């Protein structure tokens, strides 16, 4: 395609997929899929947006903390609770209240499921107004102490202990590859609590804040043809919420196992489906409708869901919080392992290797990443690994230091002995100032990684020298 400039790119991004290689082509392509530039984020937007301007594909790969990101889920705005000791005699829509020492915050709270003794198996509390109140005296999402939570006065039968915990801040969930996909949907500990808290496995599908923004609204064939009538209930928050099914749908949900899903961001319908819990079940088109393989092919851009426990006959309205995508703490290596994902021209087909993107991180991660990089093209001699130099070296200080800085680093010498970039490669290109572009995203001026760019002026000229687009001003000049 002019020799298939395909570049590829990994960094810390706003906005999952994790780790996978997910294929970008637009810069509103980009955006809608990895999206705004943070200052966390920045030098990996801007390195993607400004090669997309001599560039044809994009191949790239969002570096998460396994270990602490989070996708945006419905668990995480419950509070802990354990029922201490089952009561007898009780039933169902008996009423909680929570009280903080000796007074009334919460009074919405009812008991869900008894036994045949009328033991307490499950209940659920609203948490809106308490998290209010809590985050009002500090004790968020700490709690416990004064926090307390008794039955009604009265239920038809006695002798029940609930006991307060915290407020869950733990979606529970984390969403990277999809060859474990739904397994991680189907996880014993995050299961658990979809039955606790009486709701189904719906959630953000891109790990992130920006996936708190996402509302779910589920109705089942039940509560479709009340659709206009059915109050659905907000979980955890409270409240409720006339539905809004029968008046978006058409085609109403068929089977009783069969469900009305309407995603919403910003009050945007951003998505409409029916689905089905039951194996097989097809729409009027034999369309597999079945929840866990409608999503685990590329079924919907926002989230993702599970059959598994889900409610049966559920309808309400689901609130997604506690999503976190942490680049906070992105280690170094956790770059690398995403960097891997191009070793090998078994899988991946990918020309020029966008490197400097990590320009600005620490100035160790700056060198020992790339340097890794490196050891991927050579390794696999397919390609060109372009690299580009730390910004402490450069944009700072003035030319006459500023060179000493950059060939000591070449080698070793004299401060950047450790973090030395002293590699040697046919397929290392390295990159040898650092552009200042403005960001039309925060509408400020910033010190980028040029490595990015010329990458994109490779795909160009030639198969994969001549000025720049969109820089105003470099770190050196020139001359």
């Known amino acids: 395609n002019n020799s298939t400039g395909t570049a590829a790119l990994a960094g810390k991004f706003q906005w999952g997929p994790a780790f996978q290689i997910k294929q970008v082509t637009n810069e509103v392509d980009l955006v809608n899929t990895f999206g705004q530039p943070t200052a966390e984020t920045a030098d990996y937007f801007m390195s993607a947006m400004n090669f997309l301007q001599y560039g044809n594909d994009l191949r790239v790969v969002r570096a998460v903390d396994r270990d602490t990101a989070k996708n945006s889920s419905p668990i995480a705005g419950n509070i802990e609770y354990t029922i201490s000791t089952p009561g007898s005699n009780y039933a169902v829509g008996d009423k909680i209240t929570v009280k903080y020492v000796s007074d009334d915050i919460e009074t919405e709270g009812k ?3 008894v036994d ?3 033991k307490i198996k499950k209940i659920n509390i609203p948490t809106a107004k308490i998290i209010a109140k809590a985050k009002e005296v500090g004790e968020y999402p700490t709690l416990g102490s004064n926090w307390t939570a008794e039955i009604s006065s009265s239920s038809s039968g006695l002798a029940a202990v609930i006991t307060l915990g915290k407020i869950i801040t733990d979606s529970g969930i984390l969403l990277a590859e999809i060859e474990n996909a739904e397994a991680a949907m189907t996880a014993v500990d995050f299961q658990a609590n979809l039955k606790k808290y009486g709701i189904p496995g719906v959630v953000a599908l891109y790990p992130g804040e920006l996936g708190d923004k996402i509302e779910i609204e589920i109705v089942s064939k039940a509560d479709y043809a009340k659709g206009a009538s059915a109050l659905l209930p907000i979980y955890p928050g409270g409240g409720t919420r006339a539905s809004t099914a029968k008046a978006v749908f058409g085609y109403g949900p068929q089977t009783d196992s069969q469900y009305a899903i309407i995603v919403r961001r910003n009050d945007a319908i951003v998505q409409s489906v029916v689905l089905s819990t039951k194996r097989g079940g097809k729409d ?3 369309s597999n409708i079945y929840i866990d393989d ?7 851009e926002y989230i993702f869901a599970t059959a598994q426990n889900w409610p049966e006959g559920f309808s309400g309205i689901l609130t997604l919080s506690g999503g976190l995508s942490s680049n906070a703490e992105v280690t170094a290596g956790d770059l690398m392992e995403a960097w891997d994902f191009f070793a090998d021209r078994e899988s991946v087909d990918v ?10 991180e620490s100035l160790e991660t700056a060198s020992t990443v790339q340097k890794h990089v490196v050891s991927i093209g050579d390794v696999r001699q397919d390609c060109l690994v372009l690299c580009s130099p730390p910004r402490e070296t450069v944009v700072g200080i003035p030319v006459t230091r500023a060179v000493d800085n950059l060939v ?7 401060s950047y002995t450790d973090n030395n970039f002293n590699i040697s490669s046919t397929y290392a290109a390295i990159d040898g100032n650092y552009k200042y572009q403005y960001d039309k995203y925060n509408d400020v001026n910033r010190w980028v990684p040029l490595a990015a760019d010329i990458a994109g002026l490779c795909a160009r000229t030639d198969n994969v020298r001549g000025q720049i687009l969109n820089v105003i001003k470099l770190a050196i000049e020139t001359p």
């Open 111 to 113: 008991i869900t499921e």
């Open 294 to 300: 409608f999503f685990a092919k590329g079924g919907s």
């Open 351 to 360: 020309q020029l290797f966008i490197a400097g993107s990590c320009a600005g």
């Open 116 to 118: 045949a003794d009328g």
């Open 408 to 414: 000591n680093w070449r080698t070793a010498a004299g």
């Open 284 to 286: 009027i088109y034999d």
